[PDB]
Design a binder for this molecule. Structure first.
Ligand SMILES: Nc1ncnc2c1ncn2[C@@H]1O[C@H](COP(=O)(O)OP(=O)(O)OP(=O)(O)O)[C@@H](O)[C@H]1O
Ligand SMILES: [Mg+2]
Lengths: 97, 814, 1063
């Protein structure tokens, strides 16, 4: 969702790639200082059909991809069914069904 | 077109003037006033318009009177939309021999109209007895059809429509005859202001209108001076020695002098002529503000401002509006152009010069003259528009003049002089180099040893019967008199073009007058029940969705998997590259279609480019984004789709047995033809044992038709869909010959393409003629390769005729 | 701020000055802006306006006085500097010099008094402002008087008009100091940059005695005798302008006498060329060429057929003999002194070839009259006094041979200007035709205009024509800032001194100022037709006219914002048609430059390859088929030619073209391109050349310290990169999104370390950081901060870890997506010239041992020009593969090395892989990717984002890692049979999930899962229970039953927020 330029490549994303591989980030104050970064982990959360459709394939390679699937009858009924059953039982012994 | 902007205020003064000119005293004032207004406004605008546009504007006025129904005419609203733009409809392969295939496709648009629904079947019945006979007959618009079509020939509009569709060339002439019948006192509108010439118009227009506050605007073409005509007229009206009135020419620094002169002019009352107004674009914005201040003040009576300028962009709209516009165009003709060439050269210089030098100068004047007449023809002619001035002819004389003064008694070198005329004098204009060879033909034919003896300037003239020769040694005054008599009538044949090449011009002329008239045609009939642009786009979309476009797209991976890639060929490489381009086109047009189709029937934002595509479909022009993809060949939208599916058909036969090349290939239906030719040479280079660079492709025309099953002939590649323009290739003779008069384009038979090493040295053969092939009829930087073919006539004849090969002419069967 | 603000005086030796006023000035302007508006607008402010308005007036007063010194000090500085150190110019205009000196002393005093006062505006008051305005007006008068004096000097010397007024002023000021004047003659003339000088009698004095002249390239022409600088600057410079010509003329008489002698003489041609100068040598070549051809025509009138064939044969032997001389090591000045001759003798050979083919046996045929002929003859019936005007003594002598230049009825003397070995353009049938048009225009005393597209370099052809003639050529560029007055000065100056005027981008001129140019030009052209020695211009009538002057204007039809020329002007200038120079004729020269005997035949073959290659190969942005790429391929081939001259040319060229294009070319195009090459040289068999020392050390370093498998395809790419770095300073390591592009350059450095010495590399991402901040820009405060690129350039030279002391090869790595805005700042470094441009204008020069490596996925944002500038290298994803990672992971050598030698102390320990376990994993990886087409099939498996093959392998490995550590103790306790099942199971589970995550998108996610469930369900010997997804099951070591994921029954919580509640 960070703003994409004319060239179709995002400045904030490209920085993260420099951190993942080389492990050195140049601080805008004292640009001579390497400022090496260590024991850092990054956990992505990407929404498709939102801002940029796809991010850079060279970053996406360093990340292990995972997908949340769209809601299902079996998935919804187990999630919400357990919330309501716990609250409706406190209301009345009836109206659980 | 720019600078045709007219003010509301100026129109209102002309409109009122027309009312005051009416002398009728309420007997038939209301009728005669309307008639007088039309005349008054038309003549004002016509002066403002160029010769070519004057016709276009008269067609509007009558169609707009017809649209609103101010005069009673027999027409249909659907039929007027069909008249302005005719869509070529494919489907029927069966035609008549004499009728062109393009004319038949226009008739399939005529069939969709209810009045000419039964016309298609009537046409088939006694076609050769009646329609062939009528088609063949000249001035067909006056000739009545013998198949009980007298009823269509009574009604002048309905007749006019049929005449276009059958014969495009006679439309421009027939229209004038139609205009005269429908419009009241129309015979006076056709004559217009041709009887009065120019000098009489300018004397009249100053006195009758633009007395004060309305400055007069002149638009001059090259070789025309407005100041010479106005000064003569200026002297008769009032005493003009050059003191009272000043003919101030606009230069840099002289803007303050012109400002002082115009300021002085208003309070004094003397008129002021300004020249070269276009030369200072900053001062026109300043001048505009001065004119607006003086219109509010209202300095002295009988004051005018004349302004003369070359037509250009970035002229202020405000000035062009308020000012009356008057255009002066020199008489357009070979003879009229030759005459203007001799008038330019000073009488007293030519008399001094001896008979030899003045004789060769004459032949040069002609050479300069003929180039301007070729410029009028698009593809068949030059292939490109190049500027030619009198200064470029003068330049060439001054060099020639020196060469005669040095040689003296010793014979003059033509060989030295001709190179200069082709490579320098008229080389400077031509960059393309294909036009240069044509340019040298005219030159080579005009300049030779026998020129000084009486010799035909027009090429060959074997059985033409013009008999126009260079004048023998005589006094200067006798040269012009002979020029005027011997040129008499101006024809295409004079330049070296074929008669059918003139018909083709009236076609190209006719077509432009309707493409302009479509834009000009206002309010789209003002509703009422003709199908909207978005409906017409939806209908074409439905036809494309009915076809399996998504199926027609070829997955690259499937085709690559079928090929082993060890036994792969150069042919196979070209197709793979070609089908990729097609996939990229076919995916793009389906994307643009399914997007615009969704935008019509679904609530979604409509992009600017998508509105343009909808507009382009209604007009039935190929879209700009689509045109950019694939081939650069211009066609109709319905023709393009039919042509595209024939391209797709050529790739479908490739997908099944790719390794086995088809016996007959069609170069007319490729993305790059050149790419294919490089391929056929590559296959030969493997089989043979020499460099590919050394091998040149050499076409040889074959008498066999497509029927022959013989394919993949060793040192060979078959081709078809080549079409020859400006000539006919006879099968029986086995040679190029002069074209049939009525047949515009001559389709070539099965072409055999052999690769063979180049000659060690540059060798010129009289029998072999080098004709360029072009992808499109336009022939503008679409050169692919030089084909060779055997001709009994000299090559010089054919390069002068302009004869070339075209891939797509819209004369392709089925 | 203002009540206490100030202006420190900075001494200018000796005037206190207001420097840094602008910083105060801007603050004062800001105070005036808001303060004046607020008082009038504010209702509360309106009540106390009697205060803001008085303060606002004071703020307004300050600005006028502040602008006033700036308008006076700068202009006073300039006029004062004209008076300063110019007794010559002081005595010339006494009335103004004295008035000015009066004003300067007053100004120096007033400024000192101000440095005593507080606010300048408060000190300025009104009376002071009026006094300052009067002083400024008085100074202006001095400038006007000085300007009139400059015009008189401009009339005296033609070169001064071309020279900038700031330079002109400097020269007039330093009229005594000769060496400073000679510095600015490089701007006036085509060559003659400076003059050599005899060391003077007293060391304080600068030398006057000129022994020789120095070119722009440092070629020395010695003068016959000592040239003394006389008094007046214009007077000794005009004597120098003539002494240049005199000396060129004096040597040519000796050159032509020795020219006849070398032919028959034992001394070779190539050795004679060395002795003389680049200009005189080239002329004397062309002179003895025309004599030679003239002797061949006279023989063929006799009847000897061989006369034309022998002249052909001779010209073709000298061309070959000279071609060997360029191949053997020479001096860079001597290169072009010899290569410019190669470019004229190739044309000469093409002329005589063309004469033999057309069979032209008569002299005074057009074909001979057409060619640019040079004649060295004392014509006893000299028509040259009629054709042009006699200017120099030798032209008027008529006892000594003069040099004449004949071409199509236009004969004009070789004017002897000094060009100093600038490169002659390649002669082509278009340029021959172009020379005809321009010469005929001059013959008719009117202008000659060549019109063509951008990149034609028409201006360069018109210059090179005047260079062959030896007339000076001046180049003017018009940015639509040209005025009537500024233009008139150029035309006035051009007419005074015989000089060809070529206008660059003449098309983009204001139609107003153009209509003057047409009147000015017309008045000159009208004078040339009359041929008058003196003519009368519109203003400053009395000017010396010279017939030799000619005006050339270069229009571009396609250029945007084109203004149509007036019909009157169009008639004056003869239009010529200009086309892009043929790639065969340029390539032919470049091949003859490197010393190929068969160059001609190869050139026609070479061009044909490249032209065919563009059409048949798929359109790639990284492919460069331009002339700039061709030269960089030839230069590499040329070093290899010089190495092995005895080897034939066709087999050598073959090997070179294949080698350098292979890396850039993709695998699809590699097969066709190899077969395409076969067309050109079918008989010739190419042998692949690889350096064994470089290949061995790369293989050894990669096993020892990189812990990666030295694959035959991988090592070839590293060797190919190493070659590219040697030839090309700047290189692009382009490739696909997921490969080992980074590993390839990293492996090369560690190989250079083992090879020679340690090689520091400074990695950054340019795209990531802002374009301005990377290169570095000025802040609000007037202070420049060092950019990230800019500091590495300072740091790498000295005073850092990357310092050039002990390191043989250093290079800065960049791994961002190339952009036209970002590269534009670096486009100076991209070019062959090793110059760095910054906003500060600090000059940094790239060392020969410094290299640049760019690493990009897509070259789409990059411009086609940018691709040409540097040497490209494409790495095919399939050629590297993912196997080398997997092999490095199973061996753990890669992983082991990273832990040993990194600052990453907190790194997780990877499990120990059993020899039995390794052999199962190796077989399983290989068996599941190669055999299954269904896994890699786009149709079968639908990904959300386009995951690269390498990326999915990296996830399998990291999942497998954690699964081994957890169950390591259990795998040892178990038997090898159930362990072999368990390790396969672990892989399947890990594999499933490593490709599971990426699966999604479409209309229904469930449909894409079921398709993926089906194909993966066939996971060799191991099976999944029915009526369950592969995801839902995980492998249990103890059970061995693939037990489905157990979920914990949700427990109610008292959390108010619903987003906090997690089921
Ligand atoms: N011979 C080899 N065998 C196996 N793995 C290798 C080998 N050489 C390199 N690798 C690994 O392959 C990956 C290549 O990383 P690299 O950054 O070079 O990829 P890239 O796609 O070119 O990156 P970028 O998109 O940032 O330019 C790394 O994990 C590297 O260690
Ligand atoms: Mg990387």
């Amino acid at each position: 969702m960070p703003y994409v330029d004319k060239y179709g490549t995002q400045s904030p994303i490209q920085l993260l790639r420099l951190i993942l591989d080389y492990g050195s980030i140049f601080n805008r104050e004292q640009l001579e200082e390497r400022k090496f970064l260590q024991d850092l982990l990054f956990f992505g959360c990407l929404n498709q059909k939102s801002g940029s459709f796809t991010v850079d394939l060279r970053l996406q390679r360093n990340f292990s991809v995972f997908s949340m699937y769209t809601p299902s009858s079996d998935v919804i009924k187990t999630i919400f069914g357990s919330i309501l059953n716990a609250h409706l039982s406190t209301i009345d012994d009836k109206a659980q069904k | 077109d720019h600078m045709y902007q007219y003010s509301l205020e100026s129109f209102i003064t002309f409109f009122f003037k027309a009312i005051n000119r009416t002398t009728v005293r309420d007997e038939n004032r209301i009728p005669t006033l309307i008639l007088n207004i039309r005349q008054t406004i038309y003549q004002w605008i016509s002066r403002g318009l160029f010769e070519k546009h004057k016709l276009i504007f008269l067609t509007l006025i009558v169609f707009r009177l017809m649209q609103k129904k101010i005069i009673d005419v027999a027409y249909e609203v659907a039929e007027m939309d069909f008249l302005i733009k005719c869509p070529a409809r494919p489907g029927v392969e069966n035609t008549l021999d004499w009728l062109p295939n393009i004319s038949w496709d226009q008739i399939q648009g005529l069939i969709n109209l209810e009045e000419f629904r039964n016309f298609a079947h009537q046409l088939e019945k006694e076609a050769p007895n009646r329609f062939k006979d009528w088609y063949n007959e000249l001035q067909p618009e006056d000739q009545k059809l013998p198949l009980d079509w007298k009823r269509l020939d009574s009604m002048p509009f309905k007749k006019l429509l049929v005449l276009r569709c059958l014969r495009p060339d006679r439309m421009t002439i027939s229209l004038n005859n139609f205009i005269r019948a429908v419009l009241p006192q129309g015979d006076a509108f056709v004559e217009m202001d041709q009887k009065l010439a120019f000098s009489e118009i300018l004397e009249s227009v100053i006195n009758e209108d633009a007395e004060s506050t309305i400055p007069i605007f002149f638009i001059l073409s090259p070789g025309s001076d407005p100041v010479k005509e106005v000064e003569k007229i200026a002297k008769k009206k009032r005493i003009e020695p050059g003191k009272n009135f000043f003919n101030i020419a606009l230069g840099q620094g002289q803007d303050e002098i012109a400002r002082r002169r115009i300021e002085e002019g208003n309070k004094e009352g003397h008129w002021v002529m300004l020249q070269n107004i276009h030369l200072m674009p900053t001062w026109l914005i300043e001048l505009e503000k001065i004119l607006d201040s003086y219109s509010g003040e209202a300095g002295n009576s009988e004051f005018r401002l004349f302004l003369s300028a070359e037509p250009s962009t970035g002229i202020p709209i405000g000035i062009l509006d308020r000012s009356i516009k008057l255009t002066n165009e020199p008489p357009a003709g070979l003879k009229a152009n030759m005459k203007r060439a001799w008038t330019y050269f000073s009488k007293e210089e030519i008399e001094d010069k001896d008979p030899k030098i003045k004789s060769i100068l004459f032949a040069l004047c002609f050479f300069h003259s003929t180039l301007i007449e070729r410029r009028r023809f698009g593809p068949k002619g030059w292939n490109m528009s190049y500027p030619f001035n009198m200064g470029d002819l003068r330049d060439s004389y001054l060099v020639m003049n020196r060469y005669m003064e040095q040689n003296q008694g010793g014979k003059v070198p033509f060989n030295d002089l001709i190179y200069i005329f082709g490579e320098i004098m008229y080389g400077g204009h031509i960059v393309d180099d294909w036009d240069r060879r044509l340019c040298n033909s005219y030159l080579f034919n005009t300049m030779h040893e026998q020129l000084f003896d009486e010799l035909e300037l027009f090429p060959y003239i074997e059985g033409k019967g013009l008999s126009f020769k260079v004048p023998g040694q005589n006094p200067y005054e006798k040269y012009i008199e002979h020029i005027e008599t011997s040129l008499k009538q101006e024809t295409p044949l004079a330049y070296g073009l074929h008669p059918n090449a003139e018909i083709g011009f009236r076609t190209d002329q006719c077509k432009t007058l309707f493409n302009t008239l479509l834009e000009l045609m206002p309010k789209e009939q003002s509703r009422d029940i003709k199908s909207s642009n978005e409906m017409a786009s939806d209908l074409i979309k439905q036809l494309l969705e009915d076809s399996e476009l998504k199926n027609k797209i070829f997955n690259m991976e499937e085709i690559k998997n079928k090929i082993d890639a060890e036994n792969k060929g150069p042919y196979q490489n070209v197709f793979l590259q070609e089908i990729e381009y097609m996939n990229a086109l076919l995916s793009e047009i389906v994307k643009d279609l399914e997007e615009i189709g969704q935008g019509l029937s679904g609530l979604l934002t409509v992009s600017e480019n998508m509105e343009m595509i909808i507009e382009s479909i209604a007009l039935s022009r190929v879209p700009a984004s689509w045109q950019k993809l694939a081939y650069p060949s211009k066609r109709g939208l319905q023709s393009w789709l039919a042509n595209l599916f024939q391209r797709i058909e050529q790739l479908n036969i490739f997908r099944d047995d790719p390794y086995s090349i088809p016996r007959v290939v069609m170069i007319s239906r490729f993305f790059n033809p050149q790419s294919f030719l490089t391929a056929i040479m590559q296959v030969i280079s493997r089989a043979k044992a020499y460099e590919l660079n050394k091998l040149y492709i050499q076409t040889e025309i074959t008498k066999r038709s497509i029927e022959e099953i013989e394919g993949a002939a060793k040192e060979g590649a078959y081709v078809y869909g080549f079409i020859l323009e400006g000539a006919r290739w006879d099968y029986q003779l086995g040679q190029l010959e002069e074209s049939k008069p009525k047949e515009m384009f001559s389709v070539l038979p099965v072409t055999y393409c052999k690769a063979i090493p180049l000659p060690p040295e540059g060798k010129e053969d009289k029998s072999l003629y080098q004709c360029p092939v072009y992808k499109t009829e336009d022939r503008g930087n679409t050169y692919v390769f030089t084909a060779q073919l055997k001709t009994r006539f000299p090559p010089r004849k054919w390069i002068l005729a302009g004869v070339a090969i075209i891939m797509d002419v819209e004369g392709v069967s089925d | 701020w203002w009540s206490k603000q100030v202006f420190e005086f900075t001494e200018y030796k000796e005037t206190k000055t207001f420097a840094s006023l602008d910083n105060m000035m801007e603050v004062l302007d800001q105070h005036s802006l808001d303060l004046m508006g607020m008082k009038s607008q504010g209702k509360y402010v309106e009540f106390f306006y009697d205060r803001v308005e008085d303060w606002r007036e004071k703020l307004g007063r300050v600005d006028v006085v502040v602008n006033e010194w700036l308008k006076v000090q700068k202009n006073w500085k300039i006029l004062y500097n004209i008076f300063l150190l110019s007794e010559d110019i002081r005595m010339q205009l006494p009335e103004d010099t004295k008035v000015f000196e009066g004003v300067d002393k007053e100004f120096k005093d007033m400024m000192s008094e101000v440095s005593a006062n507080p606010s300048v505006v408060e000190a300025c008051t009104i009376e002071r402002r009026d006094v300052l305005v009067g002083w400024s007006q008085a100074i202006k008068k001095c400038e006007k008087a000085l300007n009139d004096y400059l015009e008189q000097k401009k009339k005296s010397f033609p070169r001064f008009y071309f020279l900038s007024n700031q330079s002109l002023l400097t020269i007039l000021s330093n009229g005594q100091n000769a060496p400073k004047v000679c510095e600015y003659l490089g701007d006036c003339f085509d060559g003659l940059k400076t003059l050599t000088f005899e060391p003077p009698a007293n060391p304080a004095e600068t030398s006057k005695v000129g022994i020789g002249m120095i070119s722009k390239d440092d070629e020395k022409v010695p003068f016959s005798s000592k040239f003394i600088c006389e008094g007046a600057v214009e007077h000794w410079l005009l004597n120098l302008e003539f002494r240049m010509r005199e000396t060129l003329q004096e040597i040519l008489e000796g050159a032509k006498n020795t020219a006849d002698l070398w032919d028959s003489g034992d001394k070779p041609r190539e050795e004679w060329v060395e002795g003389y100068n680049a200009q005189i040598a080239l002329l004397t070549t062309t002179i003895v060429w025309t004599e030679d051809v003239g002797r061949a025509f006279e023989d063929l009138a006799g009847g000897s057929e061989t006369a034309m064939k022998e002249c052909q044969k001779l010209i073709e032997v000298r061309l070959e003999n000279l071609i060997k001389k360029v191949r053997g090591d020479l001096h860079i000045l001597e290169r072009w002194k010899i290569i410019n001759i190669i470019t004229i003798d190739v044309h000469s050979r093409d002329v005589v070839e063309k004469f033999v083919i057309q069979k032209v046996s008569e002299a005074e045929s057009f074909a001979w009259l057409s060619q640019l002929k040079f004649y060295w003859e004392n014509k006893p019936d000299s028509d040259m006094h009629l054709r042009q005007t006699l200017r120099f003594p030798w032209e008027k002598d008529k006892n000594k041979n003069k040099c004449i230049i004949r071409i199509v009825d236009w004969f004009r003397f070789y004017s002897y200007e000094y060009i100093g070995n600038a490169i002659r353009l390649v002669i082509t049938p278009l340029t021959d035709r172009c020379y005809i048009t321009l010469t005929q225009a001059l013959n008719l005393t009117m202008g000659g205009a060549p019109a063509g597209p951008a990149g034609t370099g028409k201006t360069e052809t018109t210059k090179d024509l005047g260079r062959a003639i030896g007339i000076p050529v001046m180049v003017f560029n018009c940015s639509d800032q040209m005025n009537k007055d500024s233009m008139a000065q150029i035309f006035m100056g051009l007419s005074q001194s015989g000089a060809w005027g070529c206008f660059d981008e003449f098309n983009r001129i204001s139609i107003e100022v153009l209509s003057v140019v047409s009147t000015q030009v017309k008045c000159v052209l009208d004078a040339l037709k009359e041929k008058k020695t003196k003519f009368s211009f519109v203003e400053e009538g009395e000017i010396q006219l010279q017939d030799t002057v000619g005006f050339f204007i270069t229009m571009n039809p396609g250029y945007a914002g084109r203004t149509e020329l007036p019909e009157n002007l169009k008639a004056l200038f003869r239009s010529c048609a200009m086309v892009v120079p043929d790639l065969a004729l340029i390539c032919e020269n470049m091949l003859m430059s490197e010393g190929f005997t068969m160059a001609r035949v190869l050139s026609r073959k070479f061009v044909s390859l490249y032209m065919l290659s563009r059409e048949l190969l798929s359109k790639q942005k990284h492919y460069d088929w331009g002339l700039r790429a061709v030269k960089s391929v030839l230069r590499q081939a040329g070093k290899l030619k010089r190495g092995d001259p005895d080897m034939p040319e066709d087999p050598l060229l073959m090997r070179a073209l294949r080698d350098f294009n292979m890396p850039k070319i993709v695998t699809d195009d590699k097969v066709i391109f190899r077969r395409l090459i076969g067309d050109l040289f079918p008989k010739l068999d190419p042998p692949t050349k690889q350096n064994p020392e470089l290949k061995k050390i790369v293989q050894d370093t990669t096993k020892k310290d990189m812990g990666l498998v030295a694959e035959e395809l991988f090592v070839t790419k590293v060797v190919q990169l190493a070659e590219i770095l040697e030839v090309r300073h700047c290189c692009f390591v382009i490739g696909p999104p997921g490969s080992g592009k980074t590993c390839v350059w990293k492996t090369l450095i560690k190989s250079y370390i083992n090879s020679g010495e340690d090689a520091e590399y400074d990695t950054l991402n340019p795209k990531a950081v802002t374009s301005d901040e990377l290169f570095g820009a000025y802040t609000k405060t007037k202070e420049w901060k060092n950019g990230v690129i800019a500091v590495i350039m300072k740091n790498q030279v000295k005073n850092e870890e990357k310092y050039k002391a002990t390191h043989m090869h250093k290079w800065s790595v960049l791994d961002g997506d190339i952009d036209p805005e970002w590269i534009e700042s670096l486009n100076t470094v991209m070019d062959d010239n090793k110059v760095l441009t910054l906003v500060s204008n600090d000059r940094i020069f790239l060392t020969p041992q410094m290299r640049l490596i760019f690493e990009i996925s897509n070259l789409r944002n990059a411009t086609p020009a940018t691709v040409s500038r540097a040497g490209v290298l494409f790495i095919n994803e399939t050629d590297i593969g993912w196997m080398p990672y997997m092999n490095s992971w199973l061996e753990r050598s890669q992983i082991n090395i990273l832990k040993q030698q990194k600052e990453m102390a907190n790194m997780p320990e990877y499990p120990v892989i059993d020899d039995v376990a390794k052999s199962v994993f190796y077989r399983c990886f290989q068996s599941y990717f190669e055999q299954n087409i269904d896994v890699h099939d786009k149709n079968r498996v639908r990904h959300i984002c386009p995951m690269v093959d390498i990326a999915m392998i990296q996830t399998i490995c990291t999942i497998l890692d954690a699964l081994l550590i957890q169950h390591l103790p259990k795998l040892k306790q178990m038997k090898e049979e159930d362990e072999k099942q368990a390790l396969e199971a672990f892989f399947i589970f890990a594999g499933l999930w490593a490709i599971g995550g990426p699966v999604g998108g479409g209309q229904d996610d469930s449909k894409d899962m079921k398709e993926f469930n089906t194909v993966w369900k066939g996971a060799a010997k191991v099976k999944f229970p029915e009526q369950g997804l592969c995801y839902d099951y995980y492998y249990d070591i103890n059970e061995n039953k693939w037990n489905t994921w157990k979920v914990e029954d949700y427990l109610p919580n008292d959390q108010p927020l619903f987003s906090k509640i997690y089921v």
